[PDB]
Structure 1
Amino acid sequence: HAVAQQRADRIATLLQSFADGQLDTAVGEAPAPGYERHYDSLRALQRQLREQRAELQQVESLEAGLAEMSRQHEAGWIDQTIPAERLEGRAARIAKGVNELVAAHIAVKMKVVSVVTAYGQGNFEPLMDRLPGKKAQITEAIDGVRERLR
């Protein structure tokens, strides 16, 4: 009678904690045989709430990292990247993905600058890369510059 209520209150308290976002309490083992199923599920649920909390926090950090990277680049510090090494899982892969895509565009941009700077110096040895898709328009444009400049 007394124990039954106590064990019931314990389960209510643990569930209440989960609901309120208090995931630090250690669930532990069941008090008696008839509560094994309840506790098995409670422990499993807790592990899941903790994992999802961590993953969602990583995403929040990813948004802040992107925000700072954007701020840095608008200020001209284009070497700045999102510190993917400080993230993990999917958040880290997305961060690396953004860094690589931005880096790829910067590389094409600097290639253009490098080639035309040379033409400006009378050095016509360099040729713009042969780009695909819409980027092919850049290749033709720069070739046109070369032909006309000399």
Structure 2
Amino acid sequence: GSHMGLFNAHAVAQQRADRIATLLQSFADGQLDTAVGEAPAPGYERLYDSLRALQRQLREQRAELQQVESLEAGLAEMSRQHEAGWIDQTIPAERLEGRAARIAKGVNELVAAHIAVKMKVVSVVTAYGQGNFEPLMDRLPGKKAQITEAIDGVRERLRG
């Protein structure tokens, strides 16, 4: 209606924009818990809906990266334990979740299979060492077949 009304409309659009600016900034640096308020007026509702969606997306996305950060430490800790021979240590999948949690069990399961082969070897070789030669090393696939043939090799030497 007047020159003052125009100036005022602009001063308001400018501060509404400044608030959205402060908000996006508070996202750029982890402040993703404190919810955004409601839109200043009809024209900014869709915009504000997206801000909320964004905050939500950034929040979850940060949790997952945090996960992968816990995964690396756990793997590193397990690696250290195993180099010292403490092979019963595993990555704690219990406090992880989603993708990270699955990778952790994957690692524990992969090693468990390798350890299981050794458990069996330490076993029959222990029986071979203390007399009895009845036990036979399990048959293994691919390249692990060498373990089974090598154990058979010393199985004859003894038995005959």
TM-score (norm 1): 0.94
Superposed CA offset, 1:24-69 (max 9, x none): 3311321211001211111111111111111000000000001111
**Runs of 4+ more than 3 Å apart:** none
Residue 60 (1) aligns with residue 74 (2): no
Answer with 15-24 or 45-54: which moved more.
15-24
Superposed CA offset, 1:74-96 (max 9, x none): 12211111100110000000000
Distance in 2 (CA, whole Å) between partners of 1:40 and 1:19 is 18
Superposed CA offset, 1:74-123 (max 9, x none): 12211111100110000000000000111110110111110111011111
Distance in 1 (CA, whole Å) between partners of 2:66 and 2:29 is 17
Unaligned ranges ≥5, structure 2? 1-9
Distance in 1 (CA, whole Å) between partners of 2:115 and 2:37 is 54
Answer with 117-126 or 22-31: which moved more.
22-31
- Cα distance, 1:2 vs structure 2: 4.0
Answer with 90-99 or 23-32: which moved more.
23-32
The aligned length equals: 150
Answer with 93-102 or 117-126: which moved more.
117-126
- Cα distance, 1:22 vs structure 2: 2.4
2:104 to 95, 115, 118: 95
Unaligned ranges ≥5, structure 1? none
- Cα distance, 1:6 vs structure 2: 2.5
Answer with 7-16 or 63-72: which moved more.
7-16
Answer with 79-88 or 19-28: which moved more.
19-28
Q: Secondary structure at the match of 1:72?
A: helix
Specify the structure having the higher radius of gyration (Cα): 2
- State how 1:67-82 maps to structure 2 within 5 Å: 67-82=76-91
Instruction: Give % identity.
Output: 99
- Cα distance, 1:125 vs structure 2: 1.8
Superposed CA offset, 1:117-149 (max 9, x none): 101111112110100101111111111111111
TM-score (norm 2): 0.89
